[PDB]
Structures are given as structure tokens and as C-alpha cells.
Amino acid sequence: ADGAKIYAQCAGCHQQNGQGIPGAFPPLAGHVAEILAKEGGREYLILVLLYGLQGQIEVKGMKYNGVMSSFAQLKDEEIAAVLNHIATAWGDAKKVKGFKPFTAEEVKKLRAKKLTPQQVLAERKKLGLK
């Protein structure tokens, strides 16, 4: 799976440069590292892609109160690949100490327990994120 091409096909919101849109679509560039630095952060990123997200969240001190759809129609390998793209395309993995690329089995195991977007928000909060 080619994570750059997959993301390109879903880049209308976070944008091709990953920097998002103020107020509307949170940035990925520079912010994936913040999530990865949390214990449970890797898993959280997979949950967002499999199950979507909703609710008020803060990113870089800015408020977002949107909705993101589930992308479970992506295969395990393809979700892995797009998460490696957003983890590496803008240098985020270069922060977190020693990064292991996302793998199909990580996605498979989370797909085995379907969550709602509201529960994904709950998981975000469990990371200590506001």
C-alpha cells in the first residue's frame, strides 16, 4: 500500500501539506508527534482512522469542534500506510524517540473491537489530551 497516494486521495481536509485549516480541520504536521508521545497514542491514531472522531478538542491551543468520518473501508495495510505517511511526511516521527512504522497487525487488532466516534473521543481524553 502506498500511504502517500492513499492520503492524497483523502487530503481535502487536513490538506496535502498536513497543516490543516484553522478552526476547521486540525493540523497533522507537527501534531502527530504530540499524540505519539502519549502512551496509547499509536492506538488512538488507528482508532481515528477506523472509527472516526467527534467532539470539542484542542490542537496547538486552537479549538476544533468537528466530525471526521470512519475510514474503515481502507484495508489494514492501507491504514498502516497512511498513518506512516502522516507520521513521516512532515517530520513528526523524528521527534518521538525511536519510531516503529505502523503495521497491519496493529490495525487488525483494533478493527476487532468496533468503537463509535464518541468512544474515540473518550480514548483521546484518556491520553491526557484536551
From Swiss-Prot:
Disulfides per UniProt:
none
Q: How is it modified after translation?
A: Binds 1 heme c group covalently per subunit.
Is-annotated flag, keyword Transport? yes
- Cite the binding residues for heme c: C10, C13, H14, M68
Q: Any idea what job this protein has?
A: This monoheme basic protein appears to function as an electron donor to cytochrome oxidase in T.thermophilus.
- Give the PANTHER family listed for this entry: BLL4482 PROTEIN, BLL4482 PROTEIN-RELATED
Query: Which protein, by its recorded name, is this?
Result: Cytochrome c-552
Species the sequence originates in: Thermus thermophilus
What is the primary gene name for this protein?
cycA
